[PDB]
Structure formats: C-alpha cells, structure tokens
C-alpha cells in the first residue's frame, strides 16, 4: 500500500486564456513541489470554470522513460487523471497536463511544469 493524494485542478480564463490554480484538500493553493516517500497515487480532479469544455486527455512528460511516475490512468469523462508510482524510483520529474477543449481542436497544456520528487 501507499499514500493517496488528491489535488484539484481549477481552470479559469484570464484575458481569454487558461489559468491553472491547484488546491489541496483544505482548499489551500498548492505551494512548491510534491515530495513522495511511499508508493502510491496522486489523483488530479478537474474543476473547469472556463466554459471551453476542457477534458483531461493525459499527462505529458519531456522525460517519459525516467521511471519516476510509472503509469497514468484517466477517467472516461476526462474529469480525473492519476499518476501512479508502483516501484518508488528515486529522482525528480516534471510534467504538464494535456487537455482537449470544445471550442477548437488544439490541445491545451498547463504552463508551469509540476515537479515530483523522491529523495
């Protein structure tokens, strides 16, 4: 077993464009990098306040073969994505959320890469 973490992915529009605000369980804006020690899951819940019909389509990595995150799971409605760590690979990785929208056929990327860390 391990730890199940939950983060909410709030998306609003400012000047026509997406803004991503991450909140934890206690409705605090999330500060800094995710440090993982146990194996486990990080579940991201989409709160789309854009009116652009956003859905998760996956989570993107520049270094996808680094083994830090072992798998990604996604719900059929695109409202949840999970990062899965099965084997506790040490190191650091960075990722961006990838979303579809209903206004156009471009995919949407979260701008600031999220960092996950295992000491």
């Amino acid at each position: 077993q391990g730890l199940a973490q939950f983060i909410k992915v709030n998306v609003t529009l400012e000047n026509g464009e997406p803004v991503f605000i991450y909140t934890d369980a206690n409705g605090q804006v999330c500060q800094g990098d995710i440090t993982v020690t146990q194996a486990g899951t990080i579940t991201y819940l989409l709160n789309d306040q854009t009116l652009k019909g956003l859905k998760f389509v996956g989570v993107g990595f520049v270094t996808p073969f680094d083994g830090i995150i072992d798998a990604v799971t996604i719900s059929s409605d695109g409202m949840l994505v999970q990062l899965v760590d099965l084997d506790k690979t040490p190191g650091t990785t960075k990722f961006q959320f990838v979303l579809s929208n209903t206004a156009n056929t471009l995919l949407v990327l979260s701008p600031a890469p999220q960092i996950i860390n295992r000491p």
Copy 2:
C-alpha cells in the same frame, strides 16, 4: 489524502476459460472483502497469463449510483484500473472487472463479484 491499495489481477486459463486470482503486495492470495475507512484509491494491476490479449475496459456495477465508489480511472494500455473514493459514502457495493480480448469480440467478466465495504 487517504490510503493507496494495490491488488494484482492474475488471469490464467483452466479448461479454456478465465480464472481470476487476486494477490496483494506480499503475494498472498486475497481473502475476504475490502473494508475501507479512509478515502483513497484501489489500484488493480492486470497480469494476463491467458495468451488471449486481455485488457481492462472498466469496472461494472449492478448498483452504479450507490456512491460507494465515486469514479473509475483506466490506463491507456488497459493494464491498470483504479477505483476512486472521494467522499467516503457508507455502505457496501459489489463489482466485476470487464475486459476485452483479442481472440473474439465478446467482453470478459470476472465471475465472483468483489465486495467493498465502509462501516
């Protein structure tokens, strides 16, 4: 946050037909019902030893609106499915795994419904 549980779903064939054997972290065959207390995730990992190209396609419920499990997530390769409990609804639910195979176009169901419990 909550608890991340991991169960392996071993599938073999006996007399031409699937047999599902569930194992926990310590490689023990799983005994009894899953009792949940915290919110969290249960991750199921497919170990297909059938040669029939099995993939998870989802998790089926006879009472899908009971709120016990709030969501299901699935990996793109059909090797992982997760049950997600966000809001800790009390009660009991039963489910079966639903899989595709490459030998024919029938879906595969796990026979013995798995039971999840919150006191």
Copy 3:
C-alpha cells in the same frame, strides 16, 4: 441463413438504481431462457428511461471462449447490440449487458445473467 430475433432492453430506475425489463416483439415481458436451434442473430434494442445517458458498450461473459456466441456487434450510438451465432455450437452460456452512463464513470451491469441454450 437463420433466424433474426429482436428483444427490447427497457431500463428504468427504482430507488436510484437500474432495473432491466426485457420485452419481445409482442410487448410481452420475456420469460425463461433463449433456446436457439438455427444459426442467426439476437438483436437487443436499448430503451433507456433512466435519464442517466445509458449506452451499450458490449456484452460480457464469464466463459467467453465457450463458442456458444461467436461474436458481438454494436451500433455507433450504443443503442443496439447483437449476439451472432455463426457455427451453431451446442451448449449453454450466460451473459450480462455492459453499459456506460453519463452520470459517472462506473460501468453498469445487468444483474440477472441471460441464458442462451442450444440442445
């Protein structure tokens, strides 16, 4: 050639949960097992009265390699599924309908397995 049978799959909600009522051509509630003699097709038509956006996603079997039903076909809108018997394999099989819904990401299973028989 063979026989084309048609059954309607009425789904309503009772106490928040699905109830499946099968009707034949003459609007009679269906009684007993389907006995097949010729090759052919059984077409199931979804009449979703749940307001939960149900769609067929396939038909599930605990013994999918038994050869009784040889294939399943599905319409693009999930309103029809067909069981196909090409080679008249003798014996008995049991199955459940598997449906998606728009309220949540859990799959829906029909509870009472339908039985198909060839003497």
Copy 4:
C-alpha cells in the same frame, strides 16, 4: 422476429488494388440485388486476403435518411458489420462498405454499390 442472412466479403488485390467478391452460405458468388420481405439482419463477414490489414469501419449510403436500413452494427475487431431492418420500410437503397487499412490512412470503399430492395 425475421430472417438472418449471412454474406462473406472476400477482398483480394489485383494490380495492387482491392477486389470485392461476395459469397453466400453455399460458397456461391452472389448474384443480383438483395430482396428483403421480412424484418431482419444481414451480416457481412470480412475475409481479408489483401495483406493490407483491412477492417470494416461502417457502411456508407448516399441516401442515409431513406429508412430502408435502420441501423448498422459493427464488431470491435472490424471483421463483422450488420445491416438492421427494424420497421420494413418499402423501397430500394444502395450502399458501399467503408474499411480502414494498415498500409495508409486512406479509407477503402467497395466500388459497386450493393442494392437492397423491399417491394
């Protein structure tokens, strides 16, 4: 109920390009138009001998709202497609098979439209 008809769709290549040969149950090459009297199903089974990885993706009509065929169902492996007549609409319609292939991203169309007739 009605009649379940089965036709095999043999595809070979001649001078690099697809040739469609239809055969009935008795392995006779199919002659003329399909005349339907009862409601029912026509099941088409793909026998791809092209080495181009052909799969049915649907059945195309120039007059899709004519009501002659009421629905199309397709198997998950693209090896079967069925035309469904639920309500016995009188008249004549024409259609072509639409297939994907693994050599390129163009869809494949059967050349000679198949005609279905109800007097």
Copy 5:
C-alpha cells in the same frame, strides 16, 4: 513546400437527403477536377446545414493504393479533413467523403466522386 488549397463542403438537405455543394475561396461553386502540379495539401472544411450532426470520419477511395494521395488527416471535431500529397505521384484518383451523423448509425457518402489529377 507546396500549395495549400481550401475548399468548403456545404451540405444541405433536399427531399430529406444530403446535397453536397463545394465552394472555393471566392465563394464560387467549384467547377471540374482538381489538377495538382506541386506537392501540398487540400483542406476541406465542413459546413453542415443539415441539422443531422454530420462529421467527417475520413475520405474513401476505390483505389486506395494508387499513391496519388499519400495520406488523410482529420480534425478531432470532424470539421476538417485534408488530403496530403508528399511525393507527387502522377495520375488520377477519385474519392468520396465519408461522414457520421447523429440521426442514425449509417455512414454518409458524398455521391459524385471528386477527381484529383496530376499530368
């Protein structure tokens, strides 16, 4: 590099059935065959005025291995399809648009094959 051509695919209904009207940049109805000299792209934009929820699903060819068009690309919303010529294969090919609709599960085919020519 090459030439990017754009054609609009207007679809209306007459007597219940689709009518395809092609217009060029200057809103002229398109006359004759497309003669290509350079490599390049032909982009088709769907203007669906049918109320039948039409979407491109691909472009169909009776002679898909002729090499005249090398690839087809499609937008996620089915509003654009492109024919791609990478290697300037000489000759002539014919094609039809293949569309889904939301009224029924039959695919829709454009009737008059469009001809593309390279001298």
Copy 6:
C-alpha cells in the same frame, strides 16, 4: 489558397530519453521560428527512431485561444499532424508536440516549444 510547408520530426533516444530534431525539405536541421505570411498548412511528419512506438496525439498550446493556429488535423496512424491557419491572425504562439508511446502510458512532450509568427 496558401503555402503548404513540410517539416520532419525526427525522434531518437539519448540516455534513454527522447530527442527531437526537425528537418526541412532539403534535410537541413531547422533554424529559428516559423514566420507565416499567407494562410496555409504546416505538415509535420513523424520519423520515430526510438523503438518506443511513438504516435502523434495532437499539438499542445499554453494559449490555445489566441487564434494564431486555427485548427489541428491528425492522421489515423499518428504519423502526421498539421497546423491549419485559415484566417491569418497576427501575432505569435508557441506549441509542443504531444505523443503516445507503447512502452508506458505517459504522454511524451517535445521540450523546446516551437514558435510560429505572423508580423
């Protein structure tokens, strides 16, 4: 009409991880930003030399509603993606390629955002 540009997206692995090398028609490594003046298409062709089964799944933007690129089209095999400019919106946008792979369920992102410019 407009200009059809073609760029090849070569992907290799260095130290286990993807490296993206862009080449133009004349097999030159691509230098600087794409400056567009006419409407048109930019076609990207995937040359995957990673052995990780890469496929395009789309093109991601941090500012997807900026109108610089109006649409994205993708081939069914994920070997081609196209950026489409229909209405010549002035300004600058940045994007990354988003790819699936067959080794794991993480999406792959190209690291250095590509810049497109209209003066």
